[PDB]
Design a protein around this motif. Structure first.
Motif, PDB file in Angstrom:
ATOM      1  N   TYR A 129      40.547  -5.235   8.528  1.00 43.31           N
ATOM      2  CA  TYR A 129      40.630  -6.243   7.484  1.00 43.31           C
ATOM      3  C   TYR A 129      39.436  -6.089   6.554  1.00 43.31           C
ATOM      4  CZ  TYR A 129      36.959  -9.083   9.602  1.00 43.31           C
ATOM      5  OH  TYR A 129      35.761  -9.541  10.093  1.00 43.31           O
ATOM      6  N   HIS A 135      33.298 -18.975  13.264  1.00 41.65           N
ATOM      7  CA  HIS A 135      34.463 -18.310  12.698  1.00 41.65           C
ATOM      8  C   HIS A 135      35.747 -19.041  13.049  1.00 41.65           C
ATOM      9  CE1 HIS A 135      36.271 -16.672  16.368  1.00 41.65           C
ATOM     10  NE2 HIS A 135      35.037 -16.495  16.804  1.00 41.65           N
ATOM     11  N   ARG A 136      35.742 -19.800  14.141  1.00 45.28           N
ATOM     12  CA  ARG A 136      36.864 -20.645  14.535  1.00 45.28           C
ATOM     13  C   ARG A 136      36.774 -21.926  13.717  1.00 45.28           C
ATOM     14  NH1 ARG A 136      39.516 -21.561  19.683  1.00 45.28           N
ATOM     15  NH2 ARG A 136      38.312 -19.918  20.725  1.00 45.28           N
ATOM     16  N   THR A 137      37.355 -21.891  12.515  1.00 49.98           N
ATOM     17  CA  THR A 137      37.210 -23.003  11.581  1.00 49.98           C
ATOM     18  C   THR A 137      37.829 -24.285  12.118  1.00 49.98           C
ATOM     19  OG1 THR A 137      39.256 -22.484  10.399  1.00 49.98           O
ATOM     20  CG2 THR A 137      37.250 -21.368   9.687  1.00 49.98           C
ATOM     21  N   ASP A 138      38.901 -24.173  12.903  1.00 50.75           N
ATOM     22  CA  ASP A 138      39.584 -25.369  13.383  1.00 50.75           C
ATOM     23  C   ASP A 138      38.691 -26.185  14.308  1.00 50.75           C
ATOM     24  OD1 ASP A 138      39.557 -23.928  15.728  1.00 50.75           O
ATOM     25  OD2 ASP A 138      41.707 -23.548  15.777  1.00 50.75           O
ATOM     26  N   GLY A 180      41.923 -28.187  -0.351  1.00 51.18           N
ATOM     27  CA  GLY A 180      41.366 -28.665   0.902  1.00 51.18           C
ATOM     28  C   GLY A 180      41.339 -27.637   2.013  1.00 51.18           C
ATOM     29  N   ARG A 184      32.846 -12.426  14.073  1.00 50.69           N
ATOM     30  CA  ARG A 184      34.034 -13.005  14.686  1.00 50.69           C
ATOM     31  C   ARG A 184      34.199 -12.600  16.145  1.00 50.69           C
ATOM     32  NH1 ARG A 184      35.920 -13.438   9.176  1.00 50.69           N
ATOM     33  NH2 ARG A 184      37.130 -15.380   9.233  1.00 50.69           N
ATOM     34  N   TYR A 216      45.247 -26.311  10.816  1.00 52.32           N
ATOM     35  CA  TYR A 216      44.083 -25.673  10.217  1.00 52.32           C
ATOM     36  C   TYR A 216      44.315 -24.218   9.830  1.00 52.32           C
ATOM     37  CZ  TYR A 216      42.364 -29.609  12.974  1.00 52.32           C
ATOM     38  OH  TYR A 216      42.197 -30.844  13.554  1.00 52.32           O
ATOM     39  N   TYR A 217      45.526 -23.699   9.995  1.00 57.36           N
ATOM     40  CA  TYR A 217      45.800 -22.299   9.708  1.00 57.36           C
ATOM     41  C   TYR A 217      47.033 -22.190   8.821  1.00 57.36           C
ATOM     42  CZ  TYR A 217      42.325 -20.695  13.073  1.00 57.36           C
ATOM     43  OH  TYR A 217      41.148 -20.438  13.738  1.00 57.36           O
ATOM     44  N   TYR A 247      36.057 -13.553   3.542  1.00 66.16           N
ATOM     45  CA  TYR A 247      35.255 -13.634   2.332  1.00 66.16           C
ATOM     46  C   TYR A 247      34.818 -12.240   1.913  1.00 66.16           C
ATOM     47  CZ  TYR A 247      31.612 -15.349  -0.848  1.00 66.16           C
ATOM     48  OH  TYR A 247      30.827 -15.611  -1.945  1.00 66.16           O
ATOM     49  N   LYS A 283      30.624 -12.510   8.471  1.00 67.92           N
ATOM     50  CA  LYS A 283      31.390 -11.392   9.003  1.00 67.92           C
ATOM     51  C   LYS A 283      31.310 -11.298  10.520  1.00 67.92           C
ATOM     52  CE  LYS A 283      31.312  -8.702   4.864  1.00 67.92           C
ATOM     53  NZ  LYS A 283      30.705  -7.608   4.056  1.00 67.92           N
ATOM     54  N   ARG A 319      37.572 -30.014  13.664  1.00 68.72           N
ATOM     55  CA  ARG A 319      37.836 -31.044  14.663  1.00 68.72           C
ATOM     56  C   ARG A 319      36.557 -31.789  15.020  1.00 68.72           C
ATOM     57  NH1 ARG A 319      38.612 -34.844  17.120  1.00 68.72           N
ATOM     58  NH2 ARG A 319      40.026 -35.212  18.881  1.00 68.72           N
ATOM     59  N   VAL A 348      36.936 -22.286   4.705  1.00 65.41           N
ATOM     60  CA  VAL A 348      36.956 -20.860   5.001  1.00 65.41           C
ATOM     61  C   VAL A 348      35.592 -20.450   5.529  1.00 65.41           C
ATOM     62  CG1 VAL A 348      37.523 -18.576   4.144  1.00 65.41           C
ATOM     63  CG2 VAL A 348      38.567 -20.575   3.097  1.00 65.41           C
ATOM     64  N   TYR A 349      35.584 -19.738   6.649  1.00 68.18           N
ATOM     65  CA  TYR A 349      34.371 -19.079   7.099  1.00 68.18           C
ATOM     66  C   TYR A 349      34.019 -17.947   6.147  1.00 68.18           C
ATOM     67  CZ  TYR A 349      31.095 -16.556  10.059  1.00 68.18           C
ATOM     68  OH  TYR A 349      29.980 -15.922  10.553  1.00 68.18           O
ATOM     69  N   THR A 350      32.725 -17.762   5.914  1.00 63.93           N
ATOM     70  CA  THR A 350      32.243 -16.770   4.966  1.00 63.93           C
ATOM     71  C   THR A 350      31.628 -15.544   5.623  1.00 63.93           C
ATOM     72  OG1 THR A 350      31.897 -18.292   3.119  1.00 63.93           O
ATOM     73  CG2 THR A 350      30.470 -16.371   3.231  1.00 63.93           C
TER      74      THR A 350
END
Ligand SMILES: [Mg+2]
Ligand SMILES: [Mg+2]
Ligand SMILES: [Mg+2]
Ligand SMILES: [Mg+2]
Lengths: 106, 335, 123, 349, 335, 352
Positions: free
Chosen positions: A49, D67-70, D14, D23, C31-32, C103, D21, D74, D17-19
């Motif tokens: 990616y 990196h786990r934005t959810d 709304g 993960r 969230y996805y 990003y 690199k 939460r 996003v993680y910025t």
């Protein structure tokens, strides 16, 4: 609409040799292009990616590169399971678009 | 009252009236046709491509009530972006940029917009523009532009302009990447020229985008009754887009300014190499030709008698001296 | 921990309509983003649609513009793709994919379909 | 702090996003140390750590892998955290900062890693959130510099158990500043190595490394000045969340930042001079080649034409059969060469 | 009491009275006209230029009840811009600039703003100013400047002077534009002179901008009782414009520093080119003259007299040597 | 850190001795200015005891001790005024960066007065120490001469509000005068940079390198002094010690802003000197380039011509050295044509 061309249409090679696949776009996309594997009868699996970044758990033999609007996937050290069908995507626009598909065989 | 711009090739006037039911449009040089639409309850988009003709601009100003100062400003293509507000009309100047991939430069055009009552008046300079998306959205009823009042038209014009800024940013990113491989792998002087041109272009982009950020922020926060309270969040969206553009231009300038350093500092050690080859060749051959001149000196009184084979001995001496020069070098490995 | 399963496809006469359901386990659709992709057997992949249940923004491919309808039941945590007036080429395997954005620069964003479902045939 | 989440182009409204690199992994670890007993709780689930909001004893929650934005969304929702705070947490490319809210204090800091054999300075953003009697912490890769605080809590050493969450925040920030100090020490080692290498072996690799050090020092400057500002603002007034008995301790941290700032420009100055030195040094090398070449001219180029002056095919030449003319002229030539070599030894060339 | 200004050529007084109902114009140089107009209800603006005529300035100061220390500061010209707040009036020191061609050095101008009740005055040393925008705004009744009191007058004058920096940096942009080709195709000493003259001008510009921001902040923060709000956000906007000026000047400084670096590179590369030409000549010819001097011997007995036209053979050998010598350079891309 | 702030232990010295660190022993003086709203009295002495009773003066008093080389006077003042021995050691420690220390009874400030002498392009520093205690301000100076004359003139002729206010306003006035002198020295540095630019551009002399390098070191030391002074003014503004009375806290923000401008100026000057070095290297490179070009244009014409001369130094049994119909004139024509082509090439390449 935007279209991506993935070449070569096929590539036959043995193990242990670098395998290169190139991929271009109608208009240049910054880096939002991704590379996926596909086995016969299996869903695609993400490999690369952001045009140069390895995924998690993907083996380091794969490696992506960018040169303007020309993206490449390289396999420096091939492994027997590498032979599969490889695909691009474009994520720059809201309208995702794949490549034609390149199949690696022995 | 003189046109500062140097472009006078083409002139045209294009108008579209539109509504929920049906829309009409025309493309004619007649200047009187735009006047009755001042009284239309529907919203209308009226565009005058050629601003070189001062008479039509003066007539439009006097019919729509534009103050003389901003009317003169409209012709002034060399003006930074700004806003001005009135009891009945508002006036905003923006800039449109054209960038070519092969020719590494960009061209700037001053686009004036005036919002009053139900009509939005655009003053361009030349044919060719980036309002095709919103224009097609109006013609084909795609989107919600036709339902909303005349203000959403101004919002959509600014939206199309910032989208054009984004596609320009895409092109600049493309060229910066290509230049990165170039400087890393092919460093030369035309690379320096290209990098310097790119730096100037990004400087211009920064110095035009910052006033545009101020334009959008003032138009949002001020929110006069003319601009209405229904387009406000959309203008906030455009403001955030401008924030994105500014940050991207800043980081691009950082990268491009950082590109040139190692090449520029790489000088003065190639001179070391040319000196190395020059000195190794000189210290071998010049003393050897001096020896040849000494033992070939035409004095008529020399041991020209061979005794042992003399010519092979002289050649062997030359070879041995050359070998000893070769050995004497690279002992300190400087070469 | 993350799994996607698809149901509701396999056979329907051309010109009809059918809805495919995507059930996600060990993962929250809120969230996805969820993507429906298409692949005719022996041919290449083809993106179809994308839904972000957080806002409801909906994106469709250029081939099936307006033809299909994608939605997501957050309470039931599923993604529905309803296809209408099935054509000759629409006989293919439909895949359900998870999406996450990354990003590159402050102006360019791109997402990668890291997780995929099993994929279901439709004719 | 704004009432609206900032939009982005090409994203649905709304969206967070993680910025960065990073993960690779994800982890959650909770330390609820009380006045008498402590707990360690490592997990991957997020519903287990959430109930710890209302614990009376100070709590330290650490989440690796934002990196786990959810998970971040939460936890932000469960703790009454603003959406812009989440956007700041997930936006890596921003300088250190501090924001005071009615219910929590938000801090963005950087911790650095420096690798030998690969002169790359890597910055990792950590977000600290002091909320009520708890401290949320967001890293983005496995590994940190807060182990000393972990052993302090584990083995009851120090004062940390006696105090509330403000002292925990102070301990974390002080540990981060100490990591900055050790980073400066590593950069001192490398800059000494580079100075020697540049002064005695100037090549292209040395210039590449010197400019890499230049960019690394610039990044350290850009990250250390906001750190100083935020420490100042932390100790200056801070009425609501931090008790007065703590603000002297923060004072010390502020002092440390000043020192670090001073040092970096010291380093900066050296490297800002180093480039110039390199140029001189490389010229010196060329000079030496000069010296050699000059010598091989001075005692060899002139002799040639005298070896040509009376080595002509000239009919009117008097010294054709002089008594030992060749030996005497060659002796004179050798004397000239020897005396000129001595003359260049006078210049020590 | 003592005059310290450098210039004494001109002496002109001009007063504008701006009001909603009407606008009142001043002409001539009547010193006694201004004094009875001290307590006019409508806000008024007074320009006195050429304070070299001291008697006038002391007369107007004494009639207006100004502190003698303020007069001493006004007469002094080597003074930094600072603001002093009093119960009766407020005193601001500021500097205008001007740029010129064929003598590349920008020069400053001491201007002392004094705001007392609804009157605003200032003391210039030379004729002309950048107040043309505010003057034409007042005369032509543009915007809402006419309605508001003298605090908006001070705001408008300060904003116009701040916006003067935009045209100053546009002049600097033009000069950089000339220097671009000047250095990219004519590396020469005068190029260095011009470039670093620009560098010194830019650093002096920033040095003066810093106290300008300081005085604007001092006005903006205290909120003096006379300045009863409704103009403070305008001063915050002026602060934003000052930040814009600082960033743009820093960007220009970076550009010209890069220009100096590329001149360094050009000089180094010219030295490299010259010494490479010398190197190629020496490399290709030293073995050739050595071969020529080898056969210049004077041996009585030689074994090389005849080899099937041996002289053409040696000529071909020399040609092959020259060919390989010039050719191995070609692969290495030397020159 | 701040570990108990007790007296150090140098090994050469006895256990408790306090030693002057600077290098001036010529001057000693005590100047007292005791002023109130209505009157003011000033005097100069050399007997320390005569200035001791001014500690408890209700009106503000300004004590000045020139020549801190006399450690006995400093220690006597410290013992009487209740000043800690560590503060006395800091007073006598000239080699030291500026700092500010807040105590219960007094405020300690260390500042540097800089002087720049033209035609000897080095700048000298003089440490001045300020101790604000109760209704009195102690000043300690290394040697004669100070930038505080405008403050004395303000006190003497009753200009400004300085007479009415308390000792904190006097401390403000002294620091403000010092910062103004800093602006003056920055102006002198600018003059030096202009002159050095003229010298470095026109004449690439040897000594210009020494001048530029010493100027760069001077700017480095200037920065290393400005920064702690900026922190000192920041602490005076923000940390608001009890002895400042909170009415003069807006007065210190002005000095803080002045320090901000000074720091910006010194950074810019450092960058300008960095550019000076590059311009010097450019000019010297051109100077060597000219003679390199001369050598090149001599060699590139006289190596091929000497090659032509040598190639016919060949001696064979069968030779072409036999003259054709005027072979020597055509050889001369050939060499002339070669030389003309080479000189045209020099004209085409634009060098010589
Ligand atoms: Mg020779
Ligand atoms: Mg010879
Ligand atoms: Mg001869
Ligand atoms: Mg010969």
């Amino acid at each position: 609409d935007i279209q991506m061309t993935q070449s070569p249409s096929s590539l036959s090679a043995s193990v242990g040799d670098r395998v290169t696949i190139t991929c271009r776009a109608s208009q240049s996309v910054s880096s939002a292009v991704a590379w996926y594997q596909q086995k016969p009868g299996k869903a695609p699996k993400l490999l690369i990616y952001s045009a140069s970044s390895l995924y998690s758990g993907v083996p380091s033999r794969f490696s992506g590169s960018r040169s303007g609007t020309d993206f490449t996937l390289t396999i420096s050290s091939l492994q027997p399971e590498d032979f599969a069908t490889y695909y691009c995507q474009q994520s720059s626009s809201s309208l995702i678009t794949f490549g034609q598909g390149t199949k690696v065989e022995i | 009252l003189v046109y500062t711009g140097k472009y006078r090739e083409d002139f045209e006037i294009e108008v579209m009236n539109y509504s929920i039911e049906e829309f009409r449009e025309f493309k004619t040089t007649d200047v009187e046709s735009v006047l009755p639409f001042r009284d239309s309850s529907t919203p209308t988009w009226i565009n005058i491509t050629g601003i070189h003709r001062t008479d039509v601009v003066q007539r439009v100003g006097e019919f729509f009530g534009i103050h003389p100062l901003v009317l003169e400003d409209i012709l002034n293509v060399h003006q930074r972006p700004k806003v001005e507000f009135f009891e009945n009309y508002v006036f905003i100047v923006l800039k449109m940029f054209t960038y070519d991939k092969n020719l590494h430069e960009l061209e700037s055009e001053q686009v004036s917009l005036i919002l009053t009552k139900n009509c939005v008046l655009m003053f361009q300079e030349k044919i060719g523009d980036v309002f095709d998306p919103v224009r097609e959205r109006i013609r084909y009823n795609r989107g919600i532009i036709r339902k909303k009042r005349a203000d959403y038209l101004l919002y959509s014009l600014i939206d199309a302009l910032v989208d054009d800024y984004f596609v320009l940013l895409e092109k600049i990113d493309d060229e910066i990447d290509v230049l990165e491989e170039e400087v890393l792998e092919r460093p030369e002087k035309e690379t320096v020229q290209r990098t310097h041109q790119l730096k100037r272009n990004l400087v211009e982009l920064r110095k035009t985008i910052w006033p545009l950020r101020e334009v959008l922020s003032s138009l949002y926060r001020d929110v006069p009754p003319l601009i209405e309270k229904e387009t406000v969040p959309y203008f906030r969206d455009v403001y955030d887009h401008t924030i994105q553009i500014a940050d991207t231009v800043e980081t691009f300038r950082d990268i491009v300014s950082g590109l040139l350093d190692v090449y520029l500092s790489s000088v003065s050690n190639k001179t070391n190499e040319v000196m190395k080859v020059l000195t190794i060749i000189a210290t071998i051959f010049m003393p050897l030709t001096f020896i040849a001149g000494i033992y070939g000196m035409n004095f008529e009184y020399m041991p020209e008698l061979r005794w042992k084979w003399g010519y092979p001995v002289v050649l062997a001496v030359m070879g041995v001296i050359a070998v000893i020069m070769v050995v004497y070098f690279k002992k300190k490995k400087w070469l | 921990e993350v799994q996607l399963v698809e149901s509701g496809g396999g056979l329907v006469q051309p010109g009809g309509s059918l809805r495919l359901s995507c059930a996600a386990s060990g993962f929250n659709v809120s969230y996805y983003s969820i993507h429906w992709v298409r692949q005719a057997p022996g041919k290449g992949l083809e993106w179809v649609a994308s839904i972000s249940s957080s806002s409801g923004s909906t994106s469709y491919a250029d081939s099936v513009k307006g033809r299909f309808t994608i939605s997501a039941d957050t309470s039931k945590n599923t993604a529905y793709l309803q296809m209408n007036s099935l054509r000759a080429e629409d006989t293919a395997v439909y895949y359900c994919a998870r999406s996450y954005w990354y990003y590159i620069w402050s102006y360019s964003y791109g997402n990668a379909m890291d997780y995929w479902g099993q994929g279901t045939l439709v004719t």
